[PDB]
Amino acid sequence: AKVNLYISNDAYEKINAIIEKRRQEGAREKDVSFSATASMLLELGLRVHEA
Amino acid sequence: AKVNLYISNDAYEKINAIIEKRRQEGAREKDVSFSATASMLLELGLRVHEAQ
Amino acid sequence: AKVNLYISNDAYEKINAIIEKRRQEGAREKDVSFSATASMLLELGLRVHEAQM
Amino acid sequence: AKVNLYISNDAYEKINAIIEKRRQEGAREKDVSFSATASMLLELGLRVHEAQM
Numbered sequence: 376a377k378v379n380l381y382i383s384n385d386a387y388e389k390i391n392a393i394i395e396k397r398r399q400e401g402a403r404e405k406d407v408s409f410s411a412t413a414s415m416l417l418e419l420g421l422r423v424h425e426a
Numbered sequence: 427a428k429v430n431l432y433i434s435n436d437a438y439e440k441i442n443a444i445i446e447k448r449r450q451e452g453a454r455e456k457d458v459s460f461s462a463t464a465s466m467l468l469e470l471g472l473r474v475h476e477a478q
Numbered sequence: 479a480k481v482n483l484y485i486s487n488d489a490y491e492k493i494n495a496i497i498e499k500r501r502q503e504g505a506r507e508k509d510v511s512f513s514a515t516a517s518m519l520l521e522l523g524l525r526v527h528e529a530q531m
Numbered sequence: 532a533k534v535n536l537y538i539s540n541d542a543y544e545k546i547n548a549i550i551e552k553r554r555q556e557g558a559r560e561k562d563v564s565f566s567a568t569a570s571m572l573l574e575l576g577l578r579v580h581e582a583q584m
Contacts (some may be wrong), residue, residue, distance in 0.1 A: 376432070376433055376435065376437075376438040377430065377432050377448070378430070378431055378433055378438075378460065378461065379428055379429070379431075379461050380428070380429040380430075380431055380461065380463055380464055380465045380468055381427070381428055381429075381461065381462075381465045382427055382429055382465060382468060382469065383469065384427070386468070386469055386472050387427045389447075389472055389476075390472070391462055393475070402442070404450065406529055407432070409429070410431055410432075411451075412429060413429050413431055413468060414432075414433065415471075415475075415529070416468050416471035416472050416475055417431070417437065417464065417467055417468045417471055418449055418471065418529055419470075419471035419474045419526065419529050420466075420467030420468055420469070420470040420471030420472075420474065421437060421440055421462065421467055421471075422525045422526060422528075423470060423471070423474050423522070423525070423526065423579060423582075423583060424444065424467060424470065425440070425525070426518075426521065426522045426525050469584070470583065473582035473583075474526060474579050475571050475576035476489070476582070477575070477579050477581070478575065478578075478580045479537070479538050479539070479540060479542075479543040480535065480537055481535070481537070481538055481543075481569060482533065482534075482535055482536075482538070482566075483533070483534050483535075483536060483566055483569055483570055483573070484533050484534075484570070485532055485533075485534055485570055485573060485574070486532075486574070487532060489532075489573065489574050489577055490532035490534075492577055492581075493577070496580070502581075504577040507534065512534070513535055513536060513537065514535065514537075516534050516536050516573060517536045517537055517538055518576075519535075519537075519573050519576035519577055519580060520536060520542070520569060520572050520573040520576055521538070521542055521576070522575075522576035522579050522580065523572035523573055523574070523575035523576030523577075523579060524542060524545055524546070524572050524576075526576070526579050527541060527549070527560070527572060527575065528573060531552070
């Protein structure tokens with residue numbers, strides 16, 4: 376399914392910092408993405424909520 | 427910022443179940459939103475990621 | 479399964495503070511059990527860790 | 532501080548699998564013991580619980 380999220384300025388910067396950190400640790404620019412990262416964080420939120 | 431995201435059928439269903447539970451607990455449909463629910467779950471997930 | 483564990487003083491104090499908060503919210507019995515709360519936290523940490531696997 | 536926890540058979544099993552996956556991903560024997568992992572998951576769960584707040 377395709378959904379619109381609306382996130383804070385803070386969350387936007389933090390997700391960008393996650394990606395920058397992965398790159399510094401060796402990920403190629405094309406191997407990481409804002410949207411893949413946001414998916415991973417959405418999944419973490421769902422897991423925590425279900426618990 | 428708006429983030430348009432493809433999500434799995436699992437997540438879609440799970441977010442829908444959450445909305446449904448809230449409605450069953452008394453929430454008005456007008457104060458309920460897929461987008462709002464998912465957005466808050468992402469903000470939570472970011473805090474959880476920082477906790478790791 | 480019953481599990482014996484030594485945790486940090488800081489974690490111990492934090493779990494004690496969670497229980498005292500609940501107590502002030504009118505919680506009783508299992509809702510204020512140290513053991514039961516610690517078990518729920520261990521399960522929570524497990525569900526989280528599983529997301530990266 | 533010493534704690535006594537009840538955990539489900541399912542939870543207990545999952546901890547073992549963590550142990551195994553670690554010993555296959557840059558870790559050694561004796562280390563990644565059950566307790567160390569359990570304790571790590573409990574303190575994670577505590578930090579996760581502080582994040583829900």
